[PDB]
Ligand binder design. Structure first.
Ligand code: NA
Ligand SMILES: [Zn+2]
Length: 227
Protein backbone atom coordinates (compact mmCIF):
# COMPACT_ATOMS: atom_id res chain seq x y z
CA UNK A 1 0.00 0.00 0.00
CA UNK A 2 0.96 3.58 -0.89
CA UNK A 3 0.02 5.87 2.00
CA UNK A 4 -1.12 9.41 1.26
CA UNK A 5 -2.76 12.37 2.99
CA UNK A 6 -6.09 12.20 4.91
CA UNK A 7 -5.57 8.70 6.43
CA UNK A 8 -5.80 7.07 2.95
CA UNK A 9 -3.71 4.31 1.31
CA UNK A 10 -3.87 2.71 -2.18
CA UNK A 11 -2.94 -0.82 -3.22
CA UNK A 12 -2.53 -1.94 -6.81
CA UNK A 13 -4.07 -5.23 -7.85
CA UNK A 14 -3.33 -4.87 -11.56
CA UNK A 15 -2.27 -2.41 -14.24
CA UNK A 16 -5.70 -0.75 -14.41
CA UNK A 17 -7.13 -1.61 -11.00
CA UNK A 18 -6.33 -0.14 -7.59
CA UNK A 19 -7.93 -0.63 -4.15
CA UNK A 20 -7.83 2.09 -1.46
CA UNK A 21 -8.42 2.11 2.34
CA UNK A 22 -9.64 5.41 3.84
CA UNK A 23 -9.57 5.46 7.68
CA UNK A 24 -12.25 7.64 9.23
CA UNK A 25 -13.43 8.67 12.72
CA UNK A 26 -17.05 7.70 13.55
CA UNK A 27 -18.71 8.11 16.97
CA UNK A 28 -13.79 4.52 16.28
CA UNK A 29 -11.33 5.14 13.41
CA UNK A 30 -13.17 2.99 10.88
CA UNK A 31 -11.43 1.72 7.68
CA UNK A 32 -13.38 1.98 4.33
CA UNK A 33 -12.53 0.47 0.95
CA UNK A 34 -13.32 1.38 -2.66
CA UNK A 35 -11.68 0.98 -6.08
CA UNK A 36 -9.89 3.06 -8.75
CA UNK A 37 -10.17 1.57 -12.23
CA UNK A 38 -8.19 3.35 -15.02
CA UNK A 39 -8.26 3.27 -18.88
CA UNK A 40 -6.97 5.93 -21.32
CA UNK A 41 -6.18 8.33 -18.52
CA UNK A 42 -9.76 8.19 -17.29
CA UNK A 43 -10.69 6.80 -13.92
CA UNK A 44 -13.78 5.22 -12.36
CA UNK A 45 -14.27 5.67 -8.64
CA UNK A 46 -16.16 2.80 -7.01
CA UNK A 47 -17.40 4.20 -3.63
CA UNK A 48 -16.07 7.37 -1.96
CA UNK A 49 -14.58 7.74 1.55
CA UNK A 50 -16.93 9.16 4.22
CA UNK A 51 -16.54 12.77 3.05
CA UNK A 52 -15.75 15.54 0.57
CA UNK A 53 -12.33 16.22 2.08
CA UNK A 54 -10.97 12.68 1.82
CA UNK A 55 -12.57 12.25 -1.59
CA UNK A 56 -10.83 15.37 -2.97
CA UNK A 57 -7.46 14.10 -1.70
CA UNK A 58 -7.99 10.72 -3.41
CA UNK A 59 -9.25 12.27 -6.65
CA UNK A 60 -6.24 14.63 -6.75
CA UNK A 61 -3.66 11.93 -6.11
CA UNK A 62 -5.15 9.96 -8.99
CA UNK A 63 -4.79 12.94 -11.30
CA UNK A 64 -1.32 13.77 -10.02
CA UNK A 65 0.22 10.33 -9.51
CA UNK A 66 -1.96 8.10 -11.68
CA UNK A 67 -2.38 10.66 -14.50
CA UNK A 68 -6.08 9.98 -14.80
CA UNK A 69 -9.17 12.12 -14.46
CA UNK A 70 -12.03 10.60 -12.45
CA UNK A 71 -14.93 10.74 -14.92
CA UNK A 72 -17.10 7.96 -13.54
CA UNK A 73 -18.53 6.88 -10.20
CA UNK A 74 -20.62 3.91 -8.97
CA UNK A 75 -21.65 3.51 -5.24
CA UNK A 76 -22.31 0.18 -3.50
CA UNK A 77 -25.33 1.46 -1.62
CA UNK A 78 -26.45 4.66 0.11
CA UNK A 79 -24.25 4.57 3.19
CA UNK A 80 -21.66 7.31 3.72
CA UNK A 81 -18.72 4.97 3.16
CA UNK A 82 -20.11 4.91 -0.41
CA UNK A 83 -21.47 8.35 -1.31
CA UNK A 84 -20.18 10.57 1.47
CA UNK A 85 -17.98 12.41 -1.00
CA UNK A 86 -20.40 12.36 -3.93
CA UNK A 87 -21.16 16.02 -3.31
CA UNK A 88 -17.62 17.03 -4.30
CA UNK A 89 -17.52 14.57 -7.19
CA UNK A 90 -20.65 16.14 -8.55
CA UNK A 91 -18.99 19.55 -8.35
CA UNK A 92 -16.11 18.10 -10.35
CA UNK A 93 -18.62 17.00 -12.95
CA UNK A 94 -18.29 13.23 -12.36
CA UNK A 95 -20.90 11.04 -14.08
CA UNK A 96 -22.55 8.46 -11.84
CA UNK A 97 -24.45 5.20 -12.09
CA UNK A 98 -26.18 3.34 -9.29
CA UNK A 99 -28.95 0.92 -8.45
CA UNK A 100 -32.18 2.88 -8.84
CA UNK A 101 -32.75 1.79 -5.21
CA UNK A 102 -29.66 3.77 -4.12
CA UNK A 103 -30.80 6.78 -6.05
CA UNK A 104 -34.19 6.69 -4.25
CA UNK A 105 -32.81 6.19 -0.72
CA UNK A 106 -30.26 8.99 -1.21
CA UNK A 107 -33.11 11.11 -2.63
CA UNK A 108 -35.65 10.62 0.19
CA UNK A 109 -32.83 11.28 2.68
CA UNK A 110 -31.66 14.54 1.12
CA UNK A 111 -28.29 12.90 0.42
CA UNK A 112 -26.31 13.37 -2.85
CA UNK A 113 -28.20 11.67 -5.65
CA UNK A 114 -26.40 9.66 -8.40
CA UNK A 115 -27.62 10.41 -11.92
CA UNK A 116 -28.51 7.23 -13.87
CA UNK A 117 -30.33 4.41 -12.16
CA UNK A 118 -30.36 0.76 -13.19
CA UNK A 119 -32.58 -1.95 -11.75
CA UNK A 120 -31.14 -5.34 -12.71
CA UNK A 121 -27.66 -5.06 -14.23
CA UNK A 122 -25.75 -2.47 -16.22
CA UNK A 123 -22.40 -2.24 -17.93
CA UNK A 124 -20.54 1.04 -18.06
CA UNK A 125 -17.81 1.51 -20.66
CA UNK A 126 -14.89 3.37 -19.09
CA UNK A 127 -13.87 4.58 -22.55
CA UNK A 128 -13.62 0.94 -23.51
CA UNK A 129 -13.11 -0.85 -20.22
CA UNK A 130 -16.26 -2.65 -18.96
CA UNK A 131 -17.37 -2.11 -15.37
CA UNK A 132 -20.24 -4.58 -14.89
CA UNK A 133 -22.74 -3.67 -12.17
CA UNK A 134 -25.12 -6.26 -10.67
CA UNK A 135 -27.98 -6.03 -8.18
CA UNK A 136 -28.40 -9.56 -6.83
CA UNK A 137 -30.68 -8.91 -3.84
CA UNK A 138 -30.60 -7.21 -0.43
CA UNK A 139 -27.63 -7.80 1.83
CA UNK A 140 -25.75 -5.42 4.08
CA UNK A 141 -28.17 -2.83 2.77
CA UNK A 142 -31.40 -3.36 0.91
CA UNK A 143 -29.94 -1.67 -2.15
CA UNK A 144 -26.42 -3.13 -2.29
CA UNK A 145 -24.85 -4.11 -5.61
CA UNK A 146 -21.55 -5.61 -6.80
CA UNK A 147 -19.20 -4.31 -9.51
CA UNK A 148 -17.36 -6.94 -11.54
CA UNK A 149 -14.33 -6.12 -13.72
CA UNK A 150 -14.47 -8.92 -16.35
CA UNK A 151 -11.19 -7.93 -18.01
CA UNK A 152 -9.30 -8.09 -14.72
CA UNK A 153 -11.31 -10.82 -12.96
CA UNK A 154 -11.79 -8.50 -9.97
CA UNK A 155 -14.94 -8.18 -7.89
CA UNK A 156 -15.59 -5.29 -5.52
CA UNK A 157 -18.32 -6.93 -3.46
CA UNK A 158 -18.76 -3.95 -1.23
CA UNK A 159 -19.83 -4.03 2.42
CA UNK A 160 -22.07 -7.03 1.81
CA UNK A 161 -18.73 -8.88 2.02
CA UNK A 162 -16.61 -9.25 5.18
CA UNK A 163 -12.89 -9.99 5.18
CA UNK A 164 -11.50 -13.26 6.43
CA UNK A 165 -10.55 -11.89 9.85
CA UNK A 166 -14.05 -10.52 10.43
CA UNK A 167 -16.23 -12.20 13.08
CA UNK A 168 -19.33 -10.03 13.46
CA UNK A 169 -22.24 -9.28 11.14
CA UNK A 170 -21.81 -5.56 11.78
CA UNK A 171 -24.38 -2.80 11.23
CA UNK A 172 -27.66 -4.36 10.18
CA UNK A 173 -29.62 -1.10 10.41
CA UNK A 174 -30.52 -1.25 6.76
CA UNK A 175 -29.66 -4.86 6.10
CA UNK A 176 -31.95 -7.66 4.97
CA UNK A 177 -30.40 -10.39 7.19
CA UNK A 178 -32.52 -13.21 5.85
CA UNK A 179 -31.79 -12.44 2.17
CA UNK A 180 -28.07 -11.72 2.82
CA UNK A 181 -27.02 -15.41 2.66
CA UNK A 182 -29.09 -15.93 -0.52
CA UNK A 183 -27.45 -12.96 -2.27
CA UNK A 184 -24.02 -14.28 -1.27
CA UNK A 185 -25.03 -17.54 -2.90
CA UNK A 186 -25.83 -15.69 -6.13
CA UNK A 187 -22.56 -13.76 -6.04
CA UNK A 188 -20.44 -16.90 -5.56
CA UNK A 189 -22.32 -18.74 -8.33
CA UNK A 190 -22.01 -15.78 -10.68
CA UNK A 191 -18.26 -15.07 -10.22
CA UNK A 192 -16.20 -18.24 -9.64
CA UNK A 193 -13.37 -16.81 -11.73
CA UNK A 194 -12.66 -14.04 -9.22
CA UNK A 195 -8.96 -13.50 -8.86
CA UNK A 196 -9.45 -10.82 -6.24
CA UNK A 197 -12.54 -10.05 -4.13
CA UNK A 198 -12.66 -6.70 -2.34
CA UNK A 199 -14.94 -6.15 0.71
CA UNK A 200 -16.52 -2.98 2.08
CA UNK A 201 -14.16 -2.80 5.05
CA UNK A 202 -10.98 -4.80 5.48
CA UNK A 203 -8.36 -6.83 3.70
CA UNK A 204 -9.10 -8.02 0.18
CA UNK A 205 -8.59 -11.64 -0.84
CA UNK A 206 -10.30 -14.16 -3.07
CA UNK A 207 -13.70 -15.77 -3.28
CA UNK A 208 -13.39 -17.27 0.18
CA UNK A 209 -14.62 -13.93 1.57
CA UNK A 210 -18.00 -14.83 0.11
CA UNK A 211 -18.34 -18.17 1.97
CA UNK A 212 -16.86 -16.83 5.23
CA UNK A 213 -19.24 -13.89 5.13
CA UNK A 214 -22.08 -16.29 4.49
CA UNK A 215 -20.92 -18.26 7.53
CA UNK A 216 -20.88 -15.12 9.69
CA UNK A 217 -24.38 -14.01 8.66
CA UNK A 218 -25.90 -17.50 8.96
CA UNK A 219 -24.49 -17.83 12.46
CA UNK A 220 -26.18 -14.51 13.21
CA UNK A 221 -29.50 -15.85 11.99
CA UNK A 222 -28.90 -18.93 14.07
CA UNK A 223 -28.03 -16.87 17.16
CA UNK A 224 -31.21 -14.74 17.19
CA UNK A 225 -33.79 -17.39 16.30
CA UNK A 226 -33.36 -19.73 19.29
CA UNK A 227 -35.58 -19.39 22.42
NA1 NA B 1 -16.32 2.58 0.21
ZN1 LIG C 1 -23.08 0.33 4.55
Amino acid sequence: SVKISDDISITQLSDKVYTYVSLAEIEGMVPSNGMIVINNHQAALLDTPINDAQTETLVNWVADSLHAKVTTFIPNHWHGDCIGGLGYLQKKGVQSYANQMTIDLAKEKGLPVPEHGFTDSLTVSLDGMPLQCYYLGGGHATDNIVVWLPTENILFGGSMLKDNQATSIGNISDADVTAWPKTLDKVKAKFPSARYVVPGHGDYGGTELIEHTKQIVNQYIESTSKP
